[PDB]
């Protein structure tokens, strides 16, 4: 494992930016995450932390600012399964991020940090990442 | 076998809206269309008319305002084939519609009508639809 994926967003992201993540959850995965970060330094603020937790069957959403985590939000269940492929859309809108899993909107995360600060996508944890694409 | 597919959008669509269309272009297909319409009336204004033409090997984009069509825009060649499945994203931003076809950004259509007018997605013509989803 032990390596996160990083993708720069040269144009930043605006309402209408779509991140498509395709991958599969390894059969003994505990957790993985997708972070929208505001810069390339290791403590940088996270506009969005999307963290499916399959050892506890839940999906946590949060933000991180000046080094401290915000309040956890969480969706209905976990739309991921060990050993199973997935396709996630993270869609930037004017008032938040829409997290789509499969064929259904899973959660709407209202913006906590300004959208214009987001500068990179990071994908880490127990996941087999097939493809990260920005549209 | 096939039918005009309508998705009603009573709250409209906002920037950061993804229309995902999956289907088959059947073996003898001439052309098909995805319309973002402003109402349910016959001949409603169209914010976007997306029109792959298999018979002429072009993809046409246009609008229909106040009864008459605008000037057509064309994408580069035809990324559709008779007898092949496809995935199209139509992504609404503040300034236009982004068309993605099978992992490749394909064309950008600047708004000609205010996005707020859109009330209905219609998919018709020579296509065998798998799914239409609006996120």
Numbering used by the authors:
A (entry chain B), B (entry chain A): 2 to 136
List sentences quoted exactly from the publication behind this structure.
To date, 16 mammalian galectins have been discovered, and galectin-7 (Gal-7; also termed p53-induced gene 1 product), belonging to prototype galectins, is a multifunctional effector by productive pairing with distinct glycoconjugates and protein counter-receptors in the cytoplasm and nucleus, as well as on the cell surface. Gal-7 participates in diverse processes, such as controlling apoptosis, cell migration and cell adhesion.
Our Gal-7 in complex glycerols as dimers in the P212121 space group is the same as previously reported for Gal-7. The positions of residues His 50, Asn 52, Arg 54, Val 61, Asn 63, Trp 70 and Glu 73 coordinate with glycerol. In our crystal structure, the C and O atoms of glycerol occupy similar positions as the C4, C5, C6 and O4, O5, and O6 atoms of galactose in the lactose-bound structure. It indicates that glycerol is a small ligand of Gal-7.
